[PDB]
Paper text:
Antimicrobial resistance in [name] is partly mediated by chromosomal class C β-lactamases, the Acinetobacter-derived cephalosporinases (ADCs). Cephalosporin resistance in carbapenem-resistant [name] (CRAb) is largely mediated by Acinetobacter-derived cephalosporinases (ADCs), class C β-lactamases present in all Acinetobacter spp.. Interestingly, a common alanine duplication (Adup) is found in this region. We previously demonstrated that several [name] variants with an alanine duplication (Adup) in the Ω-loop gained the ability to hydrolyze both CAZ and FDC.
The X-ray crystallographic structure of [name]-33 in complex with CAZ was determined to 1.57 Å resolution. [name]-33 crystallizes with two monomers in the asymmetric unit. In the B monomer, electron density was continuous with the Oγ atom of the catalytic residue Ser64, indicative of a covalent bond in an acyl-enzyme complex. In the A monomer, contiguous electron density to Ser64 was not observed, suggesting either a pre-covalent Michaelis-Menten or post-covalent product complex was captured. The product of CAZ (A1BIM) was added as an alternate conformation to the acyl-CAZ in the B monomer. Electron density for the R1 dimethylcarboxylate group of both acylated and product forms of CAZ was not observed. The oxyanion hole is occupied by an oxygen in both (carbonyl oxygen [O9] of acyl-CAZ and one carboxylate oxygen [O29] formed upon deacylation in product A1BIM), with hydrogen bonds formed with main chain amides (NH) of Ser64 and Ser318. In the [name]-33 complex, the oxyimino portion of the R1 side chain is oriented toward Tyr221. In the [name]-33/product complex, electron density for the R1 side chain dimethylcarboxylate group is not observed, due to its presumed clash with Tyr221. Overall, loop flexibility, displacement of the deacylating water, and destabilization of the acyl-enzyme intermediate appear to favor hydrolysis of CAZ and product release in [name]-33.
Residue numbers in the entry: 1 to 211, 216 to 359
The structure:
Amino acid sequence: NTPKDQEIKKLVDQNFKPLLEKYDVPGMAVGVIQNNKKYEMYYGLQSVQDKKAVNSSTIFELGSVSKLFTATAGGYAKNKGKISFDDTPGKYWKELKNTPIDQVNLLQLATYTSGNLALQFPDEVKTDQQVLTFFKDWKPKNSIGEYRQYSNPSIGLFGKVVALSMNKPFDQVLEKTIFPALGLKHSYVNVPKTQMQNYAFGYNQENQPIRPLDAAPAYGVKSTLPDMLSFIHANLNPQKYPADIQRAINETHQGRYQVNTMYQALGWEEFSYPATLQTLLDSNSEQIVMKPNKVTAISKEPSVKMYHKTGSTNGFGTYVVFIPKENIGLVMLTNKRIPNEERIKAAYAVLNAIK
């Protein structure tokens, strides 16, 4: 008939390639992993002016997909006994002791239920001093633990606490501990000089090339398609890893509460599988992403589940999704933002069509 690598290439061509013309995207990397086999598709240019093709070495910004690595770092520290998720941040950032934010526990920060943390840090919050002062000045609003409000500050504080508990700067926790444990050799918080030639330009909505530190746990990671597929492989096969990181990965798969059809895990969003397309689109709706929503306890603990996460920066888009019981996952990286719904729909059509 037709070899499987060609079949998957055709499906990615049918569902992802048209997005390049439709949204004027310079470069894209799409990868599928199925039964521990990797399929990689590279399109377009990492740098338009340099005529450098997207390839297996191309480095992209992950945006909020970076939180998946922060979540994994948190599970690692927890299962190593460096933190408990019932701890409060002042136990580790002592300057926050005796402040309102010291009533919020680590799980609540990691899953956005402090009750009064906005999507972004204020533009004027730049230094670690202004970050500290931002959190000491924080005051509650809604009951802590009651409302989900997607928040970069919230998981940014989580990651700072994780770094403090491991006695290392957060960038070192990832580059010296978590990335090596996961077998990722081309993933970075800070892209070294020797790799700038592989660092894609991001492109804004005029197709112009473009490119605080405590915000790095929320959106500071860069990576390649091979590394992101290895990361998806790790999430599909935690048992293939040492106990410390195996337990860390599993920690990130544990649903913590629900908002309608969405289960909030650590970093990952989780869904009963099979999931309808609308369930997946709802997780990225304005209601869920931009507004507070009352959370509810998990009632149906789904036996068969899937996970995904979108992420964006000014010049980059990312989508990652995996389905443990089908042993399948997909990564999309672009050096131009495209609508999140397009990423989800295209991935849903590929994954459902794959034999």
